[PDB]
């Protein structure tokens, strides 16, 4: 129940040229080989994933990671114009542990269904968090942590249709996005099992129905906005993929392979701040990312229904929610 400057630890390599490593070796210390988890016996403590300064600190850290890694050729804002060199780099997020300094500790909720806000009775204390990859994405949360028991729903308030809904799955779904080469260099495609994805959607629908009983649960496409939030956007190997997810957020999900068309883009709306970032054309060759969908970002349509149906659509855009999807279980506390 206090605020302090966290630090970061990683298994980054001083010789590795991957940019995440080059940033972590400079900014993060090594991973503590002896983690000490202290389970506080018979203790209940309040958590609030939606008011957690750890999220803001991680936001700043990933902003720094990207200011070093994905330097744009052009950066345009309300009040500034920046032109600079923009060399390609090797890009692959590595796990990052977030640690409290001396005189502070990190409370960790061990209740496996805790929704991130309220009292938790299965508390322990740690020095650092587990490994958290700083994956920037929308709609689909990738390469995160799964729920250890059953699907978990997280919302500052489900009754408020303006509050994002973070879904944590208990069984990841594989998504393989590739831009091939030898045409069109900015055309890519994702493959995903329709059977596994349909099963995941059905489980998430049941869990949502638990909060909206008597209602049919519908998955539909985004209702509008920048291309960042109307597609599954994400950085793969330094290139910005925008993937059409109309075939995922669906009431008619096919049981066979699902193919999503993607575009690799150079002009992007920044999440670090309001503005545009222009990068260089895509590198040549086969650009591939086989990622684990472990979560979802959804928004529920407002107003009362007339055909007994709650509608959920993919959202995102504020990457603080990406960090919340992994930091929900943590709090920084002062020893006293």
């Amino acid at each position, epitope marked *: 129940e206090a605020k302090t400057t966290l630090f970061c630890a990683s298994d980054a390599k001083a010789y590795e040229k991957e940019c995440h490593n080059v940033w972590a070796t400079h900014a993060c210390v090594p991973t503590d080989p002896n983690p000490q988890e202290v389970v506080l016996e018979n203790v209940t403590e309040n958590f609030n994933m939606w008011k957690n300064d750890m999220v803001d600190q991680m936001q700043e850290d990933v902003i720094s990671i990207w200011d070093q890694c994905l330097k744009p050729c052009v950066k345009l804002t309300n009040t500034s114009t920046l032109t600079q060199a923009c060399p390609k780099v090797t890009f692959d997020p590595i796990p990052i542990h977030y640690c409290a300094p001396a005189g502070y500790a990190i409370l960790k909720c061990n209740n496996k269904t805790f929704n991130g806000k309220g009292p938790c009775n299965n508390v322990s204390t740690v020095q650092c968090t587990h490994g958290i990859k700083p994956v920037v994405s929308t709609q689909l949360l990738l390469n995160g942590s799964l729920a250890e028991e059953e699907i978990v729903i997280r919302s500052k308030n489900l009754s408020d249709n303006a509050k994002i809904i973070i879904v944590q799955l208990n069984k990841s779904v594989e998504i393989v996005c590739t831009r091939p080469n030898n045409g069109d260099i900015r055309q890519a495609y994702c493959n995903i099992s329709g059977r596994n994805w349909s099963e995941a959607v059905n489980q998430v629908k049941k869990k949502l129905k638990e909060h909206f009983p008597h209602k049919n649960i519908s998955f539909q496409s985004s209702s*509008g*906005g920048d291309l960042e939030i109307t597609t599954h956007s994400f950085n793969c190997g330094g290139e910005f993929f925008y993937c059409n997810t109309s075939g995922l957020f669906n009431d008619t999900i096919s049981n066979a392979t699902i193919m999503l068309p993607c575009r690799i883009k150079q002009i992007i709306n920044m999440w670090q701040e309001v503005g545009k970032a222009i990068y260089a054309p895509p590198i040549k060759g086969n650009i591939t990312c086989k990622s684990d969908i472990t979560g979802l970002l959804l928004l529920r*349509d407002g107003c009362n229904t007339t055909n007994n149906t709650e509608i959920f659509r993919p959202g995102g855009g504020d990457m603080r929610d990406n960090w919340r999807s992994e930091l929900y279980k943590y709090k920084v506390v002062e020893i006293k």
Partner: antibody, heavy 121, light 104 residues
Framework: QVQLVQSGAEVKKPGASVKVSCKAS????????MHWVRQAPGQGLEWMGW????????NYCQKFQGRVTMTRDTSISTAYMELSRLRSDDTAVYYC??????????????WGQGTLVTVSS | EIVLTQSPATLSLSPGERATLSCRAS??????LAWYQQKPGQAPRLLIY???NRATGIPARFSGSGSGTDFTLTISSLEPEDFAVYYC?????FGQGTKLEIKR
């Protein structure tokens, strides 16, 4: 001095569309959701949807899904509400509104003057 | 569904008296209720937020209270300009309002 100024009145034939604009001033246009609420002559307030001006994300009242579209132009701090396939029911004063704070955006502390839209053949 | 039932539909009182408008939520909704005033030809004006917090520039004679499903707006010593339509709001849902008329 927060100000929301909307476009002028509109008369439309059924089946047509109408786009109402709402220019904001006195605050960071991208830091607060913008809501649209209509009021038929002699009736109550009806919520239609909100838009997040930062990313353009929208949430539409299920009654209007399909024929309402909300958009924004940040360079001019303006929000747009377009209602298509109009009909006599849509005759109303349309307001843009903004909540008091960023955290809770449903306490509509700021309203436009309203834009009257009349629909009839 | 979620419905806000305001009552009475109309309320006739004299200046100086105290008015009491009720707003019922169809299900428990904690304390996220707002109260608005609306004059003819004007946009709604926020009076109360969070059930009991007076908005900016709202005089002291306005008071909001309640919780769960029953909420109330109280206006002590009615002044001539306090006669208008009063709406309650819960998220995107509005009550159908009560009209406060002058008694003579």
């Amino acid at each position: 001095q927060v100000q929301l100024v909307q476009s002028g009145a509109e008369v439309k034939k059924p089946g047509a569309s109408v786009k109402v604009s709402c220019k904001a001033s006195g605050y960071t246009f991208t830091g607060y959701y913008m809501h649209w609420v209509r009021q038929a002559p002699g009736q109550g307030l009806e919520w239609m949807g909100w838009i997040n001006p930062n990313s353009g994300g929208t949430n539409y009242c299920q009654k209007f899904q399909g024929r309402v579209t909300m958009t924004r132009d940040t360079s001019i701090s303006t929000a747009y509400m377009e209602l298509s396939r109009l009909r006599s029911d849509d005759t109303a004063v349309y307001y843009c509104a903004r909540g008091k704070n960023s955290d809770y955006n449903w306490d509509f502390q700021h309203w436009g003057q309203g834009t009257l839209v009349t629909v009839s053949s | 569904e979620i419905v806000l039932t305001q009552s009475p539909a109309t309320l006739s009182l004299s200046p100086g008296e105290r008015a009491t408008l009720s707003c019922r939520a169809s299900q428990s909704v904690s304390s996220y209720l707002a109260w608005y005033q609306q004059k003819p030809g004007q946009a709604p004006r926020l009076l109360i937020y969070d059930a009991s917090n007076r908005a900016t520039g709202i005089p002291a004679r306005f008071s909001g209270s309640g919780s769960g499903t029953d909420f109330t707006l109280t206006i002590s010593s009615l002044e001539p300009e306090d006669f208008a339509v009063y709406y309650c709001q819960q998220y995107e849902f509005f009550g159908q309002g009560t009209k406060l008329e002058i008694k003579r």
